[PDB]
Design a protein around this motif. Structure first.
Motif, PDB file in Angstrom:
ATOM      1  N   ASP B 305     104.861  22.375 -39.971  1.00  0.00           N
ATOM      2  CA  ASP B 305     104.062  21.408 -39.347  1.00  0.00           C
ATOM      3  C   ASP B 305     102.742  21.079 -39.889  1.00  0.00           C
ATOM      4  O   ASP B 305     102.147  22.403 -40.608  1.00  0.00           O
ATOM      5  N   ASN B 306     101.896  20.359 -39.670  1.00  0.00           N
ATOM      6  CA  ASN B 306     100.645  20.275 -39.951  1.00  0.00           C
ATOM      7  C   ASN B 306      99.576  20.136 -38.726  1.00  0.00           C
ATOM      8  O   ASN B 306     100.181  19.430 -37.837  1.00  0.00           O
ATOM      9  N   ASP B 445     104.100  14.191 -41.032  1.00  0.00           N
ATOM     10  CA  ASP B 445     103.414  15.452 -41.132  1.00  0.00           C
ATOM     11  C   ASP B 445     104.259  16.612 -41.352  1.00  0.00           C
ATOM     12  O   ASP B 445     103.795  17.780 -41.642  1.00  0.00           O
ATOM     13  N   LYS B 481     102.684  27.078 -35.854  1.00  0.00           N
ATOM     14  CA  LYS B 481     103.973  26.291 -35.544  1.00  0.00           C
ATOM     15  C   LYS B 481     104.879  26.310 -36.920  1.00  0.00           C
ATOM     16  O   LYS B 481     105.992  25.567 -36.808  1.00  0.00           O
TER      17      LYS B 481
HETATM   18 MG   LIG Z   1     101.282  18.046 -36.446  1.00  0.00          MG
END
Ligand SMILES: [Mg+2]
Ligand SMILES: [Mg+2]
Lengths: 740, 740, 482
Positions: B305-306, B445, B481
């Motif tokens: 994830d970002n 994302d 994450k």
């Molecule tokens: Mg995110």
RNA sequence: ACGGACACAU
RNA sequence: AGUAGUAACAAGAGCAAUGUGUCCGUCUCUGCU
């Protein structure tokens, strides 16, 4: 008569705000002001229905209910009430009024439901007269693909069907566009004659016609048959571990049966050649195979399907061969010559890397059907000469695009303009030869000026076609001429007699090798109807994904029997007919080189004690189902053809194809668990290994007390008593000794 | 023994029981009160990740704008907004190089779609910030108010009906020195409540004309209204979402249409695919990545994830991306597609509702709005809001805060996807010529990145290279994450791949229930939801039978339609009992009439009226499907068309009232528009089926249609000459009024 | 932009970028990771809308009285079967409340039940009832135009929730909720006839699933919650100004097939003018019990427990006279909480789809239906518990009831803490699974993942129980690798 | 075509 | 007090984005065996 609406428009125009709106709003702006809403938005209709049905009057209906439904039930319920306003055309209604109408309202003689919703009654007729077989439990390998949930009309696409629907229901509103097909015209006249004197609203007529005519698709995980009548019962016919055998009620579709006959033919042909008698197995499988619960040899005596693998199944039985194949729907009948297929990595016109399949070898053609004729002289990637005929002058021009797609030279592959993705939106591989076909039908100027010209001699009986649409008598294009009478009929459309031999090469009474098994297209399509090869030579459901799992599922439960055959008299184990349909996944030139490697690996597991890996005997065993070669070469993976994509299978360690899982104590094949092998982990997990390299013994992990590193192919010049460090594959190094 | 559910994960793998990790039977977290704090949090964070950029004052709006582009390169692993324009251009150039003819095809499709897009496409939206009211409105209402204010001020290009002429009017309206809009004001009055005897405030909304300044209009035209996202699963704390006004939405539509055309043809994009098509694409990516590998290669997958994706994106980077994608295109098209990033580079965020303040001596509470928070003394806030107000004060303008960096949540999903795909596209092995290479798939994302390399340190160098290139273009990978493991398992947007995608049934649990439209529609929805989850989400057959029973139980409660032989008593038990007793074939009564449930696994795809039709009484079938059905709407051909639907397809009544608020003055216009659109459909029957096109006014279209209809009826003998003369003279009277 | 050509700009900026911008892979080993840090403070208290394992029913077997099926008529018929009333005394106080108000509420309710006519009992608005239902507690909402003069306008406070410690009562509640009762609580509606063989297989499996799933205690909690939230929603929409009495009714069938109507106590609704979806209607819950609150006093923080009677209790040997307590509290609910409580029967789906999938997975391997092997061969082959002897293994029907109880408790104790904790601890569960697959897992910030998990464990007893469950599962996984 | 519901990401 | 949780309700205006996919449709009362 139309006087009431102009009087109402006069009445509305006499209001000033209404006149300003009707004079300032255009027809385009009416789409915006039609959806104008100034109140608060109603959210949560589930909760709102939960509490509104506790009220007495949750239903709003028109005021005409005051004349149709009384205010009082026989039980004394109040059925409707007037609203808080005075001149509202709307009353608040109890659901007891709905029950009163359903038990004591006016019975109608005219109901419209079986005509408007005729599609669902067709569905229920298919289910009610359908037949259920047993349920079989196995690992279902579903594949997500695009299938039809509504078949539509065969003559129409979705947009053509929508334009037919507009011409039928609202003919004075169609605007500028006309109907650009004769199929559209016949369907339009038929539907207009059908829907005369209809007291149904036109929007319901349009939606009924959309249920009949418009083809809808969806991406769905399918395991078996993919015609639209097997997709409606997809929830009933398949699950994660089970298959319910179901035949729908009614007569099957012809184009669906024509397709699945070809797929079932190619499976029986490809299964047969890896038997010891390829004819006696093909006859044993053709007589037991059923398509949509109908036997194969009764379909093979009435079908006009002209295909190469269908012709082996008919020449084995005795049905006469109409020798031709089909591209674009035309009969592409061969005359003379012989070729063989082997794919390659070539480049295309839109700068994309494509894996084409091109027929290498000379083949004389007589390509003709229903509109024209052609005699195509052709070899390897070369349209040499095509004296093409016709009936009308224009129908030759479209068939000129047909032959020049089938040619596949170094001219048409680099004269493609536009965007021609050979994949789809799900990275799904579309077949390339039909994608150039549908593209060059309307973009043909790149196939007429890049093709050039070739000089010819003025012989009678020959016309010409130029790039710019000119019929000519001095020059023409390369390899394409024009004739007048052409070739007559009843020589392509005669089913000739032939004879078959033990190895399925089909030759006629003269001796023309018309079909060889090497010319069978090795593609795995998905069938519209199910196929039951009820034989001990196949598995339950065919498919390259199913042959992989079912073979390893069978070795794992029979491991107590097969391990004893592996330990003593091992060549009886390799020659099993259960191991035989697995060989259809290995390419042809790779079969004897893999068994020669595998049995050489298996013999080093025997002469060295303690090096018994039962998880690696299982993995390598259906690659020894072939007479071996003596080719001492090194392999790190074995490739396997599944849906065109060669999946690798590593000799040492897990893969995406054969993954052993220590946590579950199971072997996972392609994401499907195929069972615990023996659960002998404590006897297993040794140090010295013998079934990874040919003539070499892995001795533990990596250690640099012996010198530099090597690779798998560079172990040819070694000696005795010499160890080394080798990259074994998958990012690791092992100490490796070439033994005595 | 203490009972622990998580110990089932000892024996079952976690992906095969992943549905026990989703607590999706309880209610999701909702937001209470204001969304001003989350708006201020996102403004503070967006200016915190970009704080080392340049500050400038806008000449047109007067706002403080932060420019982090080409800023100082980051020196740690915090989220950064310092994207380098040259690196973004290099990545888009590499995307063009690996896909030749992609940008030109996508630009040509966008050029063809710009010229044929109407203004009413902008009515496709949900709740839109209405700048004429300083409030959210529905999208069609907001567009109608904008078009009304524009044509009142002399911007009549949008009268052509094309969207691009509306966009030209949007750009031309910024030169207007004084906009004159219509605003909703209210008139308060203290009355006494009649049912609780409490003095309340009667609110009465009317319309009022005000004069906006040039700067106020420009600030409102760049204003994104904000609120909190409700019903969000998986999070502890809430975040804010934004809605743009009508001056931004057409340009955002064209930019996202171009980026959708790019994303459709990229094999590394997860948009716009979804469902089974997305899972097929991810499985194809896994198999192709193991295909483009040799056997001496490690393979690792990042489930990524970002961090703060929308806050670290930049509209100036989007401007460079849009200009490089459209290179070599017409300059009107490059200028039209550049407007949306320019408008998002100069946007402000309306702060929201404000805050509720409390007085303990007066025992009162009042909502202080966002435009009054700059005048409140700082001692009156609590501590976190005091810190938020003090570090946002230099950004605040006209009740909004200036937000130049960051895009907003979801404003450019496909363009951000193209940027992530360009970083994924950098890692081809012929471009990089490293010991590593990567590949993968990228949604908005979320990414699944597959890094291949020969050693684990090469995997580390490839992860470092990907991470630092992403940092160069403003993308910040979430270190907490994300994780990495060998290829074979990953997660992508709550799809769990363990050698193939497992089913996550809990994700579909909020859709099992009674939907709340009416009796027939809810029956159809309930059976279809059970069937769709049988097919796609692996709802087993025993659980599907249990699901049928649970749906029929909740349905029979909700519409109070228990069986006719029940012992329960409701408001409609007596009439259902009468209908049950008088009926011969009870098996043909619908469940909404106390009939038995007909549904099992095999007939889930057949509607309930079709399923019971051969078992109905002809009296009950004639009443139930009576074409004089008083509960549905009847279209006038007086004389109306016949009905098709049953009596159970009624509509439930609405409640659009607001507490103590009289709003008849703002609800007049919706009634007048509905009457005008009803009188249009008497002249144009297909208006409700297909949206009618046109630039003439509604009245001219109606009069032309009435004249040609009367003439064709006089030619066909279906009216008389006196009726023809009376229709033509009614049309001439309407034109005499329309002249004035 | 139109004349840009790349000249290795990315590699130049990568050479210029600091080496402290990196993604260093920390190898994940569950044998060396730490347990989740559970919070400290006071113990967690009970916060369900009704009593779960301490509730008492007054029952009528085969109710045949007049107006049967109407809730207050059934409540009077169930109160008629108890004659051991006495004068109620406060035996455990609600420390933040006025407890004499709760006493007067109980006496007013009992007096009005004694002489009610009609179908709906609406209590008179007295001062103790107006206190306990929170009438007049909101400040008077005013517009800011007439509020600028007010010199003490302070902003509403936004304090975080206070941390609580995990107590042992919620594990006892989960142990009791996985147990079989002596009655069927779920009455499943009829099905169409089975024509396909797969429908015969599914009906044979569904009979096993119903035999395990309908006698569970969690099914009783489902039906209790469904009845309570349904009656509260109907009362909140039709009686917005009344102080309605809603009996807590369920209806079961015993092992002999006889109907039985159970009463658990009463709910007194406040005013319900619910405009937002999160608008709270206040109610008073008064629930019968045989449980002395003075043992686990910290569980009953929000309650004022009275002693209202005595009951002859026949044990396995002989008969005692136990006290009957009435647990009284203020509670509150919104429309979305009532909406999701009326649909608790979909918990029955979430359990059974899991169990059937396990049954189907083995059925793909053994190539036959393994339903009757899983339910008839009474093997203990799924870990479901931890005794002092170690990991306890249960049958597939116990797994049915445990996963059912987990879905029910997810529905009863639904919070944002639960949503955050599940989404965050799923990553650590998948990482442990990736280790056990020999897929060599690695993290980039494991400390940040632990801080993302542990900020979601504040005061909800179910979230603290799930975090303790994760710690026990981690210890079991580390012991399996020992 | 339009509307509603649900899911996911932002 | 209570619900709750970063801000509210505890009556006196009810604030629902974008993108993607899938599915359905076409205008004075409270009783689930
Ligand atoms: Mg995110
Ligand atoms: Mg994400």
């Amino acid at each position: 008569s139309g006087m009431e609406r102009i009087k109402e428009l006069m009445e509305m125009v006499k209001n000033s705000r209404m006149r300003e709106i009707l004079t300032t709003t255009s027809v385009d702006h009416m789409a915006v002001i039609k959806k104008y809403t100034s109140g608060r938005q109603e959210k949560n209709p589930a909760l709102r229905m939960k509490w509104m049905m506790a009220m007495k009057y949750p239903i709003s209906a028109s005021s005409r209910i005051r004349e149709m439904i009384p205010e009082k039930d026989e039980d004394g319920n109040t059925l409707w009430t007037n609203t808080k306003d005075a001149g509202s055309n709307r009353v608040l209604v109890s659901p007891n009024a709905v029950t009163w109408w359903n038990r004591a309202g006016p019975v109608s003689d005219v109901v419209h439901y079986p005509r408007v919703y005729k599609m669902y009654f067709d569905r229920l007729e298919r289910l009610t007269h359908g037949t259920f077989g047993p349920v079989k439990f196995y690992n279902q390998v579903k594949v997500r693909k695009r299938v039809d949930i509504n078949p539509g009309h065969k003559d129409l696409t979705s947009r053509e069907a929508q334009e037919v629907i507009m011409e039928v229901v609202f003919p004075n509103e169609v605007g500028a566009r006309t109907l650009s097909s004769d199929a559209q015209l016949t369907i339009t006249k038929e539907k207009k004659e059908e829907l005369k004197n209809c007291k149904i609203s036109p929007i319901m007529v349009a939606y009924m016609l959309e249920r009949e005519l418009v083809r809808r698709t969806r991406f769905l995980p399918i395991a078996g048959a993919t015609s639209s009548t097997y997709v409606e019962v997809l929830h009933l016919t398949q699950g994660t571990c089970w298959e319910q055998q179901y035949t729908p009620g009614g007569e099957a579709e012809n184009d669906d049966l024509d397709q699945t006959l070809i797929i079932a033919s190619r499976n029986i042909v490809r299964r047969s050649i890896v038997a010891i008698d390829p004819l006696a197995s093909l006859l044993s499988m053709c007589h037991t195979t059923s398509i949509s619960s109908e036997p194969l040899v009764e379909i093979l005596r009435s079908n006009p399907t002209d295909e190469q693998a269908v012709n082996i199944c008919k020449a084995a039985l005795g049905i006469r061969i109409n020798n031709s194949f089909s591209f674009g729907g035309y009969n592409f009948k061969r005359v003379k010559g012989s070729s063989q297929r082997t794919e390659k990595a070539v480049l295309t016109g839109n700068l994309q890397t494509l894996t084409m399949t091109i027929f290498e070898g000379y083949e004389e053609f007589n390509v003709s059907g229903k509109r024209a004729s052609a005699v195509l002289k052709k070899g390897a990637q070369r349209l040499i000469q095509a004296i093409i005929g016709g009936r009308t002058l224009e129908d030759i021009l479209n068939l000129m695009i047909t032959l020049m797609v089938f040619s596949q030279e170094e001219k048409m592959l680099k004269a493609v303009r536009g965007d021609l993705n050979f994949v789809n939106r799900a990275n799904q591989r579309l077949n390339p030869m039909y994608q150039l076909l549908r593209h060059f039908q309307k973009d043909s100027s790149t196939l007429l000026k890049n093709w050039g010209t070739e000089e010819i001699d003025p012989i009678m009986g020959i016309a010409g076609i130029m790039p710019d649409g000119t019929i000519n008598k001095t020059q023409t294009l390369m390899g394409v001429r024009l004739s007048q009478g052409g070739v007559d009929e009843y020589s392509f459309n005669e089913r000739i007699r032939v004879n078959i031999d033990k190895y399925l090469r089909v030759r006629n009474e003269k001796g023309e090798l018309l079909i060889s098994p090497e010319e069978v297209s090795e593609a795995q399509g998905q069938e519209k109807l199910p196929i039951n090869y009820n034989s001990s030579l196949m598995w339950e459901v065919n498919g390259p994904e199913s042959i992989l799992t079912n073979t390893y599922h069978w070795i794992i439960k029979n491991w107590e029997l097969l391990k004893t055959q592996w330990m003593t008299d091992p060549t009886v184990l390799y020659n099993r007919i259960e191991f035989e349909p697995f060989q259809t996944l290995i390419p042809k030139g790779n079969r004897a080189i893999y068994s020669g490697f595998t049995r050489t690996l298996f013999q080093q597991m025997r002469d060295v004690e303690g090096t018994f890996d039962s998880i690696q005997i299982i993995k390598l065993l259906p690659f020894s189902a072939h007479p071996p070669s003596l080719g001492r070469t090194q392999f790190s993976s074995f490739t396997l053809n599944i849906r065109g994509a060669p999946l690798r299978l590593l000799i040492r360690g897990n893969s995406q194809v054969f993954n052993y899982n220590q946590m579950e104590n199971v072997i996972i094949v392609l994401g499907k668990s195929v069972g615990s092998p023996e659960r002998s982990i404590l006897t297993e997990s040794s140090s010295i290994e013998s079934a990874v390299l040919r003539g070499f013994l892995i001795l533990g992990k990596a250690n640099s007390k012996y010198g530099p590193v090597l690779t798998i192919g560079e172990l040819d010049k070694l000696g005795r008593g010499e160890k080394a460090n080798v990259l074994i594959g998958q990012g690791d190094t092992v100490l490796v000794m070439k033994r005595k | 023994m203490d009972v622990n559910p998580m110990l089932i994960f000892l024996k079952v793998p976690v992906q095969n029981a992943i549905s026990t990790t989703f607590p999706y039977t309880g209610d999701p977290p909702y937001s209470h009160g204001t969304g001003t704090g989350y708006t201020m949090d996102t403004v503070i964070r967006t200016h915190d990740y970009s704080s080392r950029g340049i500050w400038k004052t806008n000449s047109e709006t007067g706002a403080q704008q932060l420019n982090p582009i080409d800023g100082p390169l980051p020196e740690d692993n915090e989220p950064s907004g310092y994207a380098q324009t040259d690196c973004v251009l290099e990545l888009i150039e590499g995307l063009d190089r690996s896909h030749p003819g992609l940008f030109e095809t996508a630009c040509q499709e966008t050029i063809d779609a710009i010229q044929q897009t109407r203004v009413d496409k902008l009515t496709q939206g949900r709740q839109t910030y209405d700048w004429t009211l300083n409030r959210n409105q529905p999208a069609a209402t907001a567009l109608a108010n904008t078009i009304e204010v524009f044509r009142k001020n002399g911007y009549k290009l949008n009268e052509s009906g094309r969207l691009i002429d509306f966009l030209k009017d949007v750009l031309l309206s910024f030169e207007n020195d004084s906009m004159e809009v219509t605003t909703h004001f209210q008139k308060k009055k203290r009355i006494r409540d009649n049912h609780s005897k409490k003095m309340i405030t009667q609110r009465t909304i009317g319309k009022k004309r005000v004069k906006l300044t040039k700067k106020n209009y420009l600030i409102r035209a760049l204003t994104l209204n904000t609120m909190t996202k409700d019903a969000e699963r998986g999070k502890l704390k809430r975040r804010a979402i934004a809605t743009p006004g009508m001056q931004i939405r057409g340009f955002v539509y064209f930019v996202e249409l171009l980026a959708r055309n790019i994303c459709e043809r990229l094999e590394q994009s997860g948009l716009p695919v979804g469902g089974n098509e997305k899972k097929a694409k991810l499985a194809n990516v896994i198999k192709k990545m193991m295909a483009k590998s040799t056997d001496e290669e490690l393979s690792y997958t990042i489930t990524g994830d970002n961090t703060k994706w929308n806050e670290n994106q930049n509209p100036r980077i989007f401007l460079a991306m849009v200009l490089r994608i459209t290179a070599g295109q017409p300059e009107w098209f490059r200028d039209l597609l550049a407007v949306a990033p320019i408008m998002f580079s100069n946007k402000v965020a309306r702060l929201g509702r404000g805050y509720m303040f409390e007085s303990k001596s007066m025992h009162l509470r009042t909502q202080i709005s966002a435009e009054n928070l700059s005048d409140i003394n700082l001692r009156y806030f609590n501590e976190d809001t005091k810190k938020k107000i003090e570090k946002i004060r230099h950004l605040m303008v006209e009740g909004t805060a200036s937000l130049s960096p960051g895009m907003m949540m979801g404003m450019f999903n496909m363009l951000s996807t193209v940027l992530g795909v360009s970083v994924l596209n950098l890692g081809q092995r012929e471009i990089l010529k490293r010991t590593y290479w990567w590949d993968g798939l990228q949604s908005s994302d979320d990414f699944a990145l597959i890094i291949n390399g020969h050693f684990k340190e090469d995997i580390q160098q490839g992860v470092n290279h990907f991470y630092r290139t992403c940092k160069l273009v403003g993308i910040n990978m979430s270190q907490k994450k994300s994780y990495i493991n060998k290829t074979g398992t990953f997660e992508f947007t709550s799809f769990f791949y363990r050698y193939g995608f497992v089913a996550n049934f809990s994700m579909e649990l909020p859709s099992f229930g009674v939907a709340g439209n009416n009796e027939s529609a809810d029956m159809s929805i309930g059976t279809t939801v059970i069937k769709t989850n049988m097919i796609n989400n692996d709802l087993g057959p025993a659980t599907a039978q249990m699901a049928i029973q649970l749906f029929i139980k909740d349905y029979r409660y909700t519409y109070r339609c228990h069986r006719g032989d029940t012992n329960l008593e409701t408001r409609r038990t007596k009439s259902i009992k009468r209908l049950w007793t008088e009926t011969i074939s009870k098996a043909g009564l619908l469940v909404a009439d106390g009939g038995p449930n007909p549904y099992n696994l095999r007939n889930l795809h057949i509607p309930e009226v079709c399923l019971k039709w051969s078992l109905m009484d002809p009296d009950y079938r004639g009443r139930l499907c009576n074409p004089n059905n008083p509960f549905v709407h009847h279209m006038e051909v007086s004389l109306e068309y016949d009905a098709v639907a049953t009596t159970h397809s009624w509509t439930p009544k609405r409640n659009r009232s607001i507490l103590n608020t009289n709003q008849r003055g703002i609800l007049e216009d919706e009634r007048i528009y509905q009457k005008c659109c009803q009188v249009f459909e008497k002249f144009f029957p297909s208006s409700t089926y297909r949206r009618p096109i046109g630039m003439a006014s509604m009245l001219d279209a109606m009069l032309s249609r009435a004249r040609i209809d009367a003439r064709i009826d006089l030619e066909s003998g279906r009216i008389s000459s006196q009726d023809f003369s009376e229709i033509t003279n009614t049309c001439k009277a309407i034109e005499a009024l329309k002249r004035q | 932009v139109s004349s840009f050509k790349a000249n290795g700009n990315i590699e130049a900026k990568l050479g210029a970028m600091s080496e402290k911008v990196n993604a260093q892979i920390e190898s994940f080993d569950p044998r060396t990771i730490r347990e989740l840090e559970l919070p400290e403070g006071k113990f967690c208290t009970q916060r369900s809308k009704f009593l779960l394992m301490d509730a008492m029913k007054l029952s009528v077997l085969n109710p045949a009285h007049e107006g049967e099926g109407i809730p207050m008529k059934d409540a009077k018929a169930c109160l008629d079967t108890f004659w051991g009333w006495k004068k109620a005394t406060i035996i455990k106080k609600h420390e933040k409340g006025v407890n004499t108000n709760y006493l007067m509420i109980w006496e007013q309710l009992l007096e009005s039940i004694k002489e009610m006519e009609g179908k709906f009992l609406n209590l008179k608005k007295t001062n103790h009832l107006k206190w306990g239902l929170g009438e007049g507690q909101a400040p008077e909402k005013m517009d800011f135009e007439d509020c600028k003069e007010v010199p003490d306008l302070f902003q509403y406070k936004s304090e975080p929730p206070e941390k609580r410690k995990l107590a042992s009562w919620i594990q006892s509640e989960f142990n009791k909720a996985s147990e079989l009762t002596n009655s069927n609580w779920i009455e499943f509606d009829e099905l169409g006839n089975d024509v396909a063989p797969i429908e015969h297989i599914a009906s044979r499996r569904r009979n096993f699933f119903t035999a395990e799933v309908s006698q569970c205690r969690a099914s009783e909690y489902i039906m209790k919650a469904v009845y309570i939230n349904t009656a509260l929603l109907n009362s909140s929409c039709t009686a917005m100004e009344e102080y309605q009495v809603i009996p807590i009714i369920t209806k079961c069938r015993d092992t002999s097939g006889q109907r039985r109507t159970n009463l658990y106590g009463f709910i007194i609704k406040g005013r319900s003018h619910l405009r937002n979806d999160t608008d709270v209607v206040n109610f008073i819950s008064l629930e019968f019990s045989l449980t002395d609150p003075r043992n686990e006093i910290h569980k009953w923080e929000k309650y004022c427990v009275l002693e209202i009677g005595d009951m002859e209790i026949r044990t396995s040997i002989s008969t005692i006279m136990k006290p009957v307590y009435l647990y009284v509290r203020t509670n509150g609910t919104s429309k979305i909480k009532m909406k999701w409580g009326m649909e608790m029967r979909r918990c029955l789906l979430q359990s059974l789809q899991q169990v059937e999938s396990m049954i189907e997975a083995e059925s793909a391997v053994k190539e036959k239906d393994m339903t009757e092997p899983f339910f008839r061969n009474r093997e203990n082959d799924w870990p479901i518990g931890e005794s002092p002897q170690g990991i306890e293994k249960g049958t597939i029907g116990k797994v049915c009831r445990v996963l059912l109880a987990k879905s029910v408790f997810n529905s009863i104790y639904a919070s944002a803490q639960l949503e955050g904790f599940s989404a965050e601890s799923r990553k650590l569960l998948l990482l442990i699974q990736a280790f056990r697959d020999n897929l060599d897992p690695g993290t980039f910030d494991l400390k940040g993942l632990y801080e993302a998990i542990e900020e979601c464990i504040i005061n909800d007893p179910w979230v603290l129980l799930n975090a303790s469950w994760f710690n026990s599962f981690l210890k079991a996984v580390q012991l399996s690798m020992g």
